[PDB]
Amino acid sequence: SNIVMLRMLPQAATEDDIRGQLQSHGVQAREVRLMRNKSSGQSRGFAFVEFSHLQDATRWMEANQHSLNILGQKVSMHYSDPKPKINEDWL
Secondary structure (H helix, E strand, O other): OOEEEEEOOOOOOOHHHHHHHHHHHOOOOOEOOOOOOOOOOOOOOEEEEEOOOHHHHHHHHHOOOOEEEEOOEEEEEEOOOOOOOOOOOOO
């Protein structure tokens, strides 16, 4: 899988906090879904982070033993899908 659902985030965390954590492991995020949007609803105490490479999700997962820590909150990580297999990317 290349998606990393980050459950148990705080309200206060940002898209940019996560950019920091990804880059500390030396992993690009392809995309980040954490607050900001309003519309789709990314502002709940989770993220839906996606990687360019299926291995890279597993990289960030296992290199943190399947738990991160952002603004002190203990965050869990879960594959919410294998990959986005929609035929559209603007729907």
